[PDB]
Antibody, heavy 222, light 210 residues
Framework: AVQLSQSGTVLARPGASVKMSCKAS????????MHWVKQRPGQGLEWIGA????????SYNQKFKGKAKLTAVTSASTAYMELSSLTNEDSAVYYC????????????????WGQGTTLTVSSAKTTAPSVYPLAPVCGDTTGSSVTLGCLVKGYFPEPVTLTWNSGSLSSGVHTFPAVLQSDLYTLSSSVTVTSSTWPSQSITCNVAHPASSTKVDKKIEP | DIVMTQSSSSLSASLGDRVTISCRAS??????LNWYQQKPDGTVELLIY???RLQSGVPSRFSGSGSGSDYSLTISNLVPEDIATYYC????????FGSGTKLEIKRADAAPTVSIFPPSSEQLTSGGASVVCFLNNFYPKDINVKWKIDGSERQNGVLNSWTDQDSKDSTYSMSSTLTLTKDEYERHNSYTCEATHKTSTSPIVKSFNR
């Protein structure tokens, strides 16, 4: 029914500028207001502003005037937002949602939202990750199980697909969120199996970084 | 501009519980306040509108109330899918979203299972030395990790990452990495990561020597 499809992940260097879209369908594009909301990693929702495709009226959250510019194309039923003078504080997820035009009643809200367009502001260039096996040492055993690990370091941009033994070993796995380390992402993952299964039965780490078409397999050795 | 504030930063409850989330405006917003739900996947959903009106298709488990500057969201009985982050929104004067409040399920207390890992030979040849320490499956979420090299605490060069509550066992897990230069790592013998958690007064110690 009512559908709001947004552009894909965008990568930009500081100072630069970008323009993302939101394609609406299933309703009269010119009967609603198109709003834009921002959300940084682990942060809350912050209203940016809105525009009325019908006549082109726009309302902005003072904070964003000079950073965000809203636009629309009735002929294509698509909303556009342009962010300028990009900085690190601009890296976040941006959602588009709709709000009804006044016509009496109380049904005014953000009933439909877009899936969100991720924007990452960085100067780093495409970088394939280094994969390091984490073999256990005395003390890395608990109960009748042992813990193994894999370290993915220095890659850009996100994401990376990490599996164990081609995907067959999925339980007892802990893949942690990537974090920054010199403008490059670093990620970790642990796997816990029955102490008897290792190392009689090999355990391998599988890393894939689409951006660089890289594929690395690291077998954990004692 | 009107500021919204949800004192409730993180809420812990049990399945079947009756949970209530607060929201406060800087001024009377005349009941112009909506409630939204954001699932861990990032999906956002409209729950209640105009303070107390339940949106179509939303489980009757949800309801809103309040007036003036104080408003709140209540869930009759909590179910697995309700575990998410909730935001309130005022629309009396432009638009403003609350700070947000996340829900988490209660479970039995669990001490972290700690394991430490020395730098791989591959990374060492690259001139780098990373020491990793896993603190898996613990509860509550509050946990403190400390690194020591040859018995001396070290803060610099430590990066941490936290997973969200597990959807199966409701536990939490942490990963701490101590990155040093190959030379530094080769100057010292013992590396230790200690975990401090509600489940005990004495820290969980994991260490190794070269």
């Amino acid at each position: 029914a009512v559908q709001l499809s947004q552009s894909g992940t965008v990568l930009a260097r500081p100072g630069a500028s970008v323009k993302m879209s939101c394609k609406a369908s299933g309703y009269t594009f010119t009967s609603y207001w198109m709003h834009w909301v921002k959300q940084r990693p682990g942060q809350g929702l912050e209203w940016i502003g809105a525009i009325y495709p019908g006549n082109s009226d726009t309302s902005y959250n003072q904070k964003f005037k000079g950073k965000a510019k809203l636009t629309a194309v009735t002929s294509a039923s698509t909303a556009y937002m342009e962010l300028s003078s990009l900085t690190n504080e601009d890296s976040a997820v941006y959602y588009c949602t709709r709000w009804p035009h006044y016509y009496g009643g109380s049904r005014y809200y953000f009933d439909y939202w877009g899936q969100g367009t991720t924007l990452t502001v960085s100067s780093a260039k495409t970088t394939a990750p280094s994969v390091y096996p984490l073999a256990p040492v005395c003390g890395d055993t608990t109960g009748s199980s042992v813990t193994l690990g894999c370290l993915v370091k220095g890659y850009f941009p996100e994401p990376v697909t990490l599996t164990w033994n081609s995907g067959s070993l999925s339980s007892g796995v802990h893949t942690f969120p990537a974090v920054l380390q010199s403008d490059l992402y670093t990620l970790s993952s642990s796997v816990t199996v029955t102490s008897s299964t290792w190392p009689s039965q090999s355990i391998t780490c599988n890393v894939a970084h689409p951006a660089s078409s890289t594929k690395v397999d690291k077998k954990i050795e004692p | 501009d009107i500021v919204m504030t949800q004192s409730s930063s993180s809420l812990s409850a049990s399945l079947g519980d009756r949970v209530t989330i607060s929201c406060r405006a800087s001024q009377d917003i005349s009941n112009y306040l909506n409630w939204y739900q954001q699932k861990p996947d990032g999906t956002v959903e409209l729950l209640i509108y105009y303070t107390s009106r339940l949106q179509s298709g939303v489980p009757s488990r949800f309801s809103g109330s309040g007036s003036g500057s104080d408003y709140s969201l209540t869930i009759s009985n909590l179910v697995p899918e309700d575990i998410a982050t909730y935001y309130c929104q005022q629309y009396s004067k432009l638009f403003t979203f609350g700070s947000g409040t996340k829900l988490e399920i209660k479970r039995a207390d669990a001490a972290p299972t700690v394991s430490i890992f020395p730098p791989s030979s591959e990374q060492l040849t690259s001139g780098g030395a990373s020491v990793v320490c896993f603190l898996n499956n613990f509860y509550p979420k509050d946990i403190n990790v400390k690194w020591k090299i040859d018995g001396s605490e070290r803060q610099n060069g430590v990066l941490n990452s936290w997973t969200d509550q597990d959807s199966k066992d409701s536990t939490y897990s942490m990963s701490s990495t101590l990155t040093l230069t190959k030379d530094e790592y080769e100057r010292h013998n013992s590396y230790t990561c200690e975990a401090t958690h509600k489940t005990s007064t004495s820290p969980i110690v994991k260490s190794f020597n070269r």
